[PDB]
Design an enzyme around this catalytic site. Structure first.
Site, PDB file in Angstrom:
ATOM      1  N   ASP B 380      -4.585  -1.286  -3.364  1.00 32.62           N
ATOM      2  CA  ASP B 380      -4.766  -0.769  -2.003  1.00 32.62           C
ATOM      3  C   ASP B 380      -6.004  -1.309  -1.304  1.00 32.62           C
ATOM      4  O   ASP B 380      -7.103  -1.175  -1.836  1.00 32.62           O
ATOM      5  CB  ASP B 380      -4.848   0.748  -2.051  1.00 32.62           C
ATOM      6  CG  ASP B 380      -4.808   1.371  -0.690  1.00 32.62           C
ATOM      7  OD1 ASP B 380      -3.717   1.445  -0.097  1.00 32.62           O
ATOM      8  OD2 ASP B 380      -5.883   1.789  -0.216  1.00 32.62           O
ATOM      9  N   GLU B 409      -2.879  -5.975  -1.443  1.00 29.57           N
ATOM     10  CA  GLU B 409      -2.393  -5.478  -0.161  1.00 29.57           C
ATOM     11  C   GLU B 409      -3.477  -5.631   0.894  1.00 29.57           C
ATOM     12  O   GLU B 409      -4.092  -4.654   1.322  1.00 29.57           O
ATOM     13  CB  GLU B 409      -1.949  -4.025  -0.253  1.00 29.57           C
ATOM     14  CG  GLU B 409      -1.201  -3.548   0.988  1.00 29.57           C
ATOM     15  CD  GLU B 409      -1.995  -2.554   1.806  1.00 29.57           C
ATOM     16  OE1 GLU B 409      -2.915  -1.927   1.246  1.00 29.57           O
ATOM     17  OE2 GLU B 409      -1.689  -2.395   3.006  1.00 29.57           O
TER      18      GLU B 409
END
Ligand SMILES: O=P(O)(O)CN1[C@H](CO)[C@@H](O)[C@H](O[C@H]2O[C@H](CO)[C@@H](O)[C@H](O)[C@H]2O)[C@H]1CO
Ligand SMILES: O=P(O)(O)CN1[C@H](CO)[C@@H](O)[C@H](O[C@H]2O[C@H](CO)[C@@H](O)[C@H](O)[C@H]2O)[C@H]1CO
Lengths: 648, 648
Positions: B380, B409
């Site tokens: 993340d 990401e």
């Protein structure tokens, strides 16, 4: 240890061969150092270039800026000082003050966490003040802290106190830098001015003789030197000055067999009379050479000698060092070639039997000429000798004698040309003579003044004894004037080969770039006095161009150059700037027809507003104009080829 | 020592950060190694690539070719073997035999000292013969030598004897190489197949609950896995599976205050029930998780867990490790943000306080989940954490466990995305969702399949829980079909987020890319059996596309991709090839109107001649066509979104 630092700083430029070879500059030359810089999260970064000299001393505070929004590419201009091996690093850092200002400018008028925001600012300015060496500047910041820390003042006033011009100035010089992260150092080689800037003149001493003695000597040829200095040249390049072979000597117009008194090619070096460390007997003695060099020096002329690592069949090496040549099975040696050119009068050197001996002898010869005042060498066809050979030799010589300049005469493919520049050649010949249209000139100079400028210094010879371009053949004197203006103003180093002034432009035959009755194979006496008297020379224009260069710093550099659009394919316009000096050149590339065009100047590149109008002086004529965003020109071939203007 | 070798070999590519990080590949993957290669003089050169495995074993003899005339850029395709750290070098050499053949082919019919030329050839082939290990190959060359050395035969015949295909073949395998010169080695990291190739499915376990127990458990969610495997996916990505904070918990539709039995964001990790090494109590136990992972494995599914390095205010670290957060002067911690996004339910991590503790705990956490069968992590917002932190962590983990795959990401600026890929992330999210026009897709995929492929492996999620693109909103099901085809066929790795196949496409509000009633803040039960029964799903298409990928090697690689011209902006065409397998894809980007167009195939890029006509089968329909240099296509939304064709 990680490859990436706390604050990423990547892909620092200029860089040459991933850092194994140095980028180049000369004394007083400015260029841009750039890097990719960013951090994690959304807070601000700053960056600066740290340039260290050969003695390890850091340069002035040199902050960078993002070169374009969203690119994370940062850059700054630096300037090279004393000659030697420098190094540079880029430092990247968090800029908490910028971030704090950003948030504060939003939050204070909104009444959002104001006491907290102002206190965070006070604590930052305190940390900033910690590293400020000057006591009054430091006190100025502490005063800002104290005003920030004052609940009896309005939020807007407390913030405002943090935004004064004096504070901005202090933080500008000594910012608070978080998490300073440095690049690995890159090498920079700074060499003397003449490596980048100078005007060159090529001539054959043997052609400058007397009625009594047609074959010139150094003694007789030195008489030509004052005229060369008066034209404003700085360097004189002489073809090989050594004895010339007799076996398979070339006759006039590059014919295979010499007859009678044919003098042969200077590049066919060597005889029983001596080799590359010897002087052609018809030229005089070593004492005569010393005299020539001295008279040149007194006139402000440096000598560049041709170094052609090859030899005639009569060279001593042929019998003294057979292993320096490739022999066919019957023991014979094939003459050298660089197809389609054939050199029937010489043998090529083979480098893989005795590379140490060849290198050692080469530097012995060079060191010999250096002892006799030669600090520049023009190197013949280096691309037909091993690259690492030149790398080694140049490293050896510059290792002891960094002032020595080597010029690579490599008209070949781009890869080889670039590699030769990168391994130590101070200067390179270029594709200049074959760039004559506006598109050709613009694209090529964009290339030369761009990334390549970090390793290559161009020497624009507008002609050479081997290259008489068709542009000149078909164009006559107006074309010589155009090419002179172009060469002189586009490169900080340019040159011509004797006879260019006289607009000598008769080819050997149609389709050839050779001169008819080439000076390479015969004495070519010229009546300079008569040409001067009859005005059939552009020597005055050459002199003026060199004077303009000498009077305008913008023309003594390479990297700052911008092309401006015109509405005529035949008319080109460009500008060069150095400090407050700005030169604007407009050239009519059509040597046959008068051309009128509108020139639309890119004003911010000149440091002006689009609406602004500025006075210019054409230094070729002394005429003054007032030019703006749209200017009419005005160029008649023969009366004037171009404007070479300074900005008033 | 010189920087350039005897035979120059320069700017070897691929290269990552000037050699400080490895280029990447996976097992079985081919890519091009290239270099700049030339020599002094006019003789021919040869070059070859040497790949050494982690044990130092060289790969097969791999000769290069000049990629384009006059450029001196040479290249060859290589193929990666077993996983590990490899290295590659380029060898450059003089090719005297090629040179000799060139000269001899001219000189012999012309009669120019032919005895000498043939002897040079004989001596050359003798040298070539000396190196050849094979006895029969040796005898073939020595026979050629003897034929060359036979003055009783015609010159043309003696030469012809040196030019047979048998001889060509021998020298083709074991050429005579002069002055072999090597590049410095570059590192190549070979990782497992799944790093480049695989199909991903994202879903929320908590949504797969029961009428009697709405909040799903790992045991209930496991019953969803068979359908996922049946759709042909290889990897399942789960959002964070840990306890979720209560302080400042967000409500449905990203509202500030949770009410009642609101479930909150999975990314608000941590409570007194445990942190990143613990499981949400409503999901079940570690034993239940082990069961889920085991059932997935049984079905051929790998688990990718979300690693989100951030904390809810109730996370134990907040009081156990206060120095892992940035505190404001009042002791409070500002909630995280990614402007303009605000994350009021979490605190961001501060990294320059105890960097070692953070790294150590991170790898401790990762190793915990690895010990329970997780070999892939979806990371993340890595770009809001220091780059060197990830470089360190990934290096640490892969140092012991090289099979572990990290997916970045990072939807941010190109510089950060590239750097993250370069420092170790096996896979990257991309700009894919925002590339929807022909120009956008072509240019971006040209970028990704080009130089970037040396360090970055794309994972094409056509959607995520945070990204519902306008293209899908306006286009409905046919648009979902289009984007599915595109994602699945343009990247060897692609993915969808649960609900995509149901064509869920209602945004939060006009102008948003957020979902209405987002699964991030509420349970989202879906009646899959009903959707299947009523046929309101493209699950069969997904299944078909993954089957096609599994059956066609062209689609399981990245770098071989070519776009073919069409006469409609709305119609795109491209081909991919791997060995004898060729896939040709034509897509109607218009999800609303039938489009007809002419597709003009670039036949050489397909390995076909310009006049050829080739049979193709559309694997979406089973229909067969015969296509050539110009082909009519008609594509109708809702029926035939695209052709996904195999050749022959
Ligand atoms: O290929 P290039 O470098 O342009 C020609 N090289 C020099 C340039 O500096 C030319 O002066 C020279 O070419 C002349 O000299 C040759 C040998 O002395 C002659 O065979 C040839 O007839 C003539 O032309 C030759 C030197 O190496
Ligand atoms: O910027 P992005 O990386 O795309 C958003 N991050 C995740 C993607 O990996 C999103 O799922 C997530 O955003 C959710 O979680 C936030 C806090 O947990 C909420 O404030 C936000 O209401 C929601 O949307 C947030 C996590 O880091």
């Amino acid at each position: 240890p990680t490859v990436v630092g706390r604050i990423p700083v990547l892909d620092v430029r200029p860089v040459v061969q991933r850092g194994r070879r140095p980028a180049k500059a000369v004394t007083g030359e400015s260029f841009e150092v750039s890097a990719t810089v960013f951090r994690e999260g959304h807070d601000a970064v700053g960056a600066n270039v740290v340039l260290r000299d050969p003695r390890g001393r850091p340069g002035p505070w040199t902050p960078m800026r993002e070169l374009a929004p969203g690119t994370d590419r940062w850059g700054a201009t630096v300037t090279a000082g004393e000659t030697g091996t420098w190094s540079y690093t880029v430092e990247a850092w968090g800029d908490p003050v910028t971030t704090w200002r950003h948030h504060a400018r939003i939050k204070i008028p909104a009444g959002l966490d104001t006491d907290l925001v102002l206190e965070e600012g006070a604590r930052l300015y305190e940390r900033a003040a910690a590293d400020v060496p000057g006591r009054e500047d430091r006190r100025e910041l502490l005063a800002a802290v104290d005003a920030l820390r004052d609940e009896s003042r309005p939020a807007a006033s407390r913030l405002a106190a943090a935004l004064t011009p004096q504070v901005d100035a202090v933080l500008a010089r000594h910012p608070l830098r978080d998490l300073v992260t440095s690049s690995d150092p890159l090498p920079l080689l700074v060499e003397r001015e003449r490596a980048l800037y100078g005007a060159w003149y090529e001539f054959f001493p043997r052609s400058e003789g007397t009625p009594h003695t047609p074959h010139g000597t150094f003694r007789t040829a030195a008489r030509r030197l004052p005229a060369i200095a008066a034209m404003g040249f700085d360097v004189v390049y002489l073809p090989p000055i050594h004895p010339i072979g007799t076996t398979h000597r070339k006759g006039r117009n590059n014919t295979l067999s010499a007859t009678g008194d044919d003098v042969g090619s200077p590049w066919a070096i060597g005889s029983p009379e001596g080799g590359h460390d010897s002087i052609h007997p018809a030229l005089g003695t070593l004492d005569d050479f010393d005299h020539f060099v001295t008279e040149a020096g007194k006139l402000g002329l440096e000598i560049a000698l041709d170094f052609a690592l090859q030899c005639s069949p009569d060279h001593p090496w042929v019998h003294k060092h057979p292993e320096w040549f490739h022999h066919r099975p019957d023991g014979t040696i094939a003459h050298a070639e660089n197809p389609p050119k054939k050199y029937q009068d010489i043998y090529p050197i083979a480098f893989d039997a005795d590379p140490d001996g060849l290198a050692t002898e080469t530097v012995r010869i060079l060191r010999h000429w250096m002892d006799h005042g030669v600090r520049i060498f023009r190197v013949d066809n280096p691309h037909t000798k091993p690259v690492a050979f030149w790398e080694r030799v140049i490293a050896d010589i510059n290792g002891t004698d960094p002032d020595v300049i080597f010029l690579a005469e490599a008209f070949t493919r781009p890869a080889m040309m670039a590699t030769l520049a990168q391994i130590g050649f101070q200067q390179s010949y270029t594709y200049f003579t074959w760039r004559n249209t506006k598109q050709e000139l613009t694209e090529y100079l964009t290339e030369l003044s761009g990334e390549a400028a970090s390793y290559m210094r161009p020497n624009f010879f507008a002609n050479t004894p081997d290259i008489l371009h068709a542009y000149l053949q078909h164009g006559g004197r107006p074309a010589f004037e155009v090419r002179a203006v172009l060469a002189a103003t586009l490169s900080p180093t340019w040159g011509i080969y004797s006879g260019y002034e006289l607009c000598e432009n008769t080819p050997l035959r149609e389709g050839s770039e050779e001169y008819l009755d080439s000076e390479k194979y015969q004495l070519k006496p010229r009546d300079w006095t008569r040409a001067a008297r009859e005005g059939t020379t552009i020597a005055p224009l050459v002199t003026r161009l060199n004077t303009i260069r000498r009077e305008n710093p913008a023309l003594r550099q390479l990297r700052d150059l911008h092309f401006h659009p015109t509405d005529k394919e035949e008319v080109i316009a460009y500008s060069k700037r150095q400090g407050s000096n700005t030169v604007l050149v407009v050239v009519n590339l059509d040597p046959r027809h008068t051309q009128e065009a509108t020139v639309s100047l890119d004003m911010p590149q000149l440091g002006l507003d689009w609406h602004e109008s500025v006075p210019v002086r054409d230094e070729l004529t002394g005429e003054t104009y007032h030019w703006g965003r749209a200017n009419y020109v005005r160029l008649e071939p023969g009366r004037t080829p171009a404007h070479v203007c300074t900005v008033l």
